[model samples]
Target chain A: AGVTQTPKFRILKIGQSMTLQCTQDMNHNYMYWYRQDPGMGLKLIYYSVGAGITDKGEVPNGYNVSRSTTEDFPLRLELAAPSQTSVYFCASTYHGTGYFGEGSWLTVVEDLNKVFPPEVAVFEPSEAEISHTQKATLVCLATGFFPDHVELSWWVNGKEVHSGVCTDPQPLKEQPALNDSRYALSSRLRVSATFWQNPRNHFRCQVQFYGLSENDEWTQDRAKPVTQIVSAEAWGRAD
Target chain B: IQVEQSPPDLILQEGANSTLRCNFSDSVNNLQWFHQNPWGQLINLFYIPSGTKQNGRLSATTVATERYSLLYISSSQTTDSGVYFCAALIQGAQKLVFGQGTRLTINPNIQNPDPAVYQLRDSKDKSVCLFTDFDSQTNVSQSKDSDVYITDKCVLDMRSMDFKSNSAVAWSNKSDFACANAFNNSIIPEDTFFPS
Candidate 1:
């Protein structure tokens, strides 16, 4: 998770003591904590300036803050109130999937839960013809994905199949049933059969989706396409 | 202006314990507590704790702690999902305002960025904003509890988040109380927050 939080939810039984943990991977210069009371709205608990820099807090604010670095921030509430039992949020201006180029730091979870990277697939060519100077047709499949819209690509020798003889995305046969109008698409690549003569040849299908990026700012980050590759050995043996 | 919005986010486990609190110095609008999920659904936990309601396994009660009130989330679960929130309408011509955030000396090699304006929608509707960042250029090195009242307004799309500011009418340092002699009162409205 880009802005991973812990406990998700915790209940304080009258005299219970607990700490709410929060961490930011985007290396935000500033971070904040809040307790949204049912009737009063939201209250500031503890705000961290940054990792190994400086900070502040109060029990009048009734909150103590802790972050070993920008990587960890935990809030400990001692014998907190029931009216005090509201959903809490931790946020920052740091560029992350939750808070990035966009100003809004909040993420609507369903959209996140609905997203997944494309599943790259390799189906052994029914017509396996191996030759040093020939072309090969391999069908790469993308299946069981959530996002309705996705981008598909291919790779050869660690390089993306950008300039090439490639086929557009087509629906995979026997589409599995799911919900959320779950989406799937696949790209078939036509590569030089001779390209596989090398013992080091590797190929795979790549899929890109949107949800969270490497940076973790969900709302504003990219899914960062995923790849599933196979070696030339997948075809049987070498001469 | 100079409002305090803290921690920004949180996490907990089931059968565990947690407590949260609130303070408002300006005013109140709907003055409600909130949450969000993997699915975009909005549920107001309790109107007031007395105004409070239960979701599934989560329940909260409200009582005065000190100068403020509290909300407690206990025995959490995967069932209790989504982000709970705070927001209310503050009076005195406030449109946009940010809490006292980290005054930074950001490293380009490790920094993300700040906001110019945010377009957010509450449980009800969408809102727009505009921010006037004063320290965007300086090497901001102030403590979390630094003193001074120039009050940089952040004007988040959501205001009154954790506040009911029922103290001195004006943030002005009173020369003398008891007597209602208010002078040099200044209120600046910004960002023009409105639901669409």
Candidate 2:
């Protein structure tokens, strides 16, 4: 196993006591593991070693994680219990694909469910009317991510739409990371949907995530009435 | 004491763009901030003291030697956002010293209701509403109970209000009641609050 160093930190579970949370940062050739503390102290256990050690834990089996590197790897333990029995988590970081170790525990089944409405947002034009034939762009911005994965989509008048080349958002300059904070990432998508003399088109923005169920979809929409006019006449107009 | 001359305030027209300014007396090596928004929320912004920067709709510029900075905002709207701040550093100090920030209120139009402006009203309302109910006579009851329960040789006095913890959980919990009490009681020596 490789050596990995983790800054000492403590987490408290409701009504339960405490346990030792130790990690080493070693750039060795093997694997790492992750675990969580149960009410009895430590319950969930997982193990993974480079080419040698790899296994799963016992109980009804809650979730699974894998190894990525010998230097940096973290594990998340969800709602736990004392009767679940045993210290949780132990993961190994690998050079490429991350791996997790397995262990044993007791399963107490309970109903845990959540339903998130498909995310939908509507953006009204900052100006009253966007002129026809001029390059008009509309953008939707949404942020704050958990688990670092999300997808964005655009639509016009209830149908899927694509952003024109001239309307694509330019990449913003990168900002430096603050102490212990991740570098902020931002993206802008511009859509050029021109309405010729017509002012009743709708624009919609939607965000999709992997955790969403098959029937789950979130959406947002905005509408504006377009007016037809000479390009030169609407040039300096704010819309 | 090093003095950073930041504009005491800034006024930005809604829908029209503007910049906030800050000037320092000496070279600033590091800069950052705890922005107090109209909602009274403290947000963290920028870590690098000397840099040309942009985040989404906002951009900032800093000159280390000249000890000055500027924030340029384009196409400002109602939510173009909260109080903008600039903090500077002393050459060798670990902590960044903050300036009394420029309070910015984005007014899109005279007719558009501004939340930041309304926040002021809300705060005033709370003060007026609680003026008589909040008692100054009660002293904080100090707890003398000390239980030595050792688990893995770690004993964290969660009750201690120390800045050593990077997370603001404890601070946030304490800030609501403790800060007001501290201000009213004046039990904390003035020298400790303003350490020279």
Candidate 3:
């Protein structure tokens, strides 16, 4: 089926209206609409059987759908409730797992969960710093997240530097843990203080991760992601 | 080709081992088990669409090319907590058909079950044989509710929490991807784990 999804991003005011679009040219008779609340996980919202039948699932309060034909199923939200804000997907399937949608997981209103946003930390060289010929490694340590989906990007003030720019298979190092729920990983950006050229040439190691923090009320203020720089007056900072 | 799994959710004590089964509807040459850790990394645990292999205390086997793949994790730790997902590519197809994954949680501090929640069939659900590639100390967890299926060589935890696709299921096939909905009372448990 030539399945295509639309509106990779969207935002609605208190009274605005919208219909996240989904369609498949396979002319098959099975489809599902799921609402993924960032972090908490996927909740089944709605599903369709044939061209005319629709059903409400786990979340039945504010969403609705209509299938004009076997080829298209348009989901409409008349009044945008804040609870309706999430990434939704339009997908098709065959019997027991033969799912063939080439395009899925189109995010809206931005990201879900047990997520711990990477606590970004950057280390500069002290007198214990990079050598004068000046080759040094800056470590960006991502710690205490449940899963291991995280990355580090190297930046020189702003321009991209290093093979670690938020892609998988980066210069990753896994800090092993025992049978506990916590884990740690680090990325070392080995740069030539020669090419970084200037001591004042601000080098940054930006870490990205879906994380949770201490004293997280679990449910309150979820969307607000806080990033911590360095704490304590202690500094290896030597310009 | 399509793949389907069963028993949507699982909970076990930290010391126990578990097995997960993925049944497909056609001849699939690619069967993969993904460990979706709490940090959300969909890391591939196994890449076998056929046969058997082991790593650490975790071992997996596919019954020739019949239709299912089994993942065995022995001596599970709380570190093993998270969802385990199975996906298969239908022979020549590049896209892998995935399943609503099995959500497994390993509780470290274990205690015997309270009788108040007991049922007649509860005790019948015992710890079976499980051999992994990681540790020699096999973890053995038993529960009456969600997972931990017993075999001569392993225990299986039947559960799920993935499938950002329900995406598909409920049919049978002839070969790879030629898989099926292989869970239920009519299922014939095959001793293919240590298949000679």
Q: Individual DockQ of the candidates?
A: 0.02, 0.02, 0.02
Model 1: residues >4 Å from true position, as ranges?
Answer: A39-41, A53-60, A95-239, B2-196
Write the candidate numbers in order of decreasing DockQ. 3, 2, 1
**What TM value does chain B of candidate 2 have?**
0.50
lDDT tens per residue, model 1, B1-196: 2233344444443345545555545353223344543222334454442245465655544332322334456665434544554333234421212232211111111121221211211111211111212222322121122111112221111112221100011111233321111111222123211112
Candidate 3 on A84-183: residue-level lDDT in tens?
A: 7566756665442323232233211212243334444443322222332133334444445533334456666566674412122211222223321344
lDDT of 1 by residue, A1-239 (tens): 45555655332334445676676777766666655332233344565667654344222255567767877766677655434445566665432112311111221223344445555445432122223114333444455554333446666766776443233312322223333434434333444555544457666666654434343334536543332322221331135
Q: Candidate 2 lDDT, tens digit per residue, A161-205?
A: 543211111111112232111111121222222442235655455
Where does the lowest 10-residue lDDT sum fall in candidate 3 chain B?
A: B115-124
Angstrom error at residue A53, model 3:
3.2
State model 1's lDDT: 0.38
TM-score of every candidate: 0.26, 0.27, 0.38
Error of 2 at B105 (Å): 1.0
Q: Which candidate is the best by lDDT?
A: 3
- Model 1 lDDT, residue A42, Cα: 36
- The share of true interface contacts that also appear in candidate 2 amounts to 0.00
* Residue-by-residue lDDT tens digits, candidate 2, B1-196: 2334345555455566767777766644565533444322334455546788777776777776777777777777544445665544446432233455665545423331111100001100111000000111212232121211001100111122210100000001122433233223323222222111
Per-residue lDDT value at B175 in model 1: 34
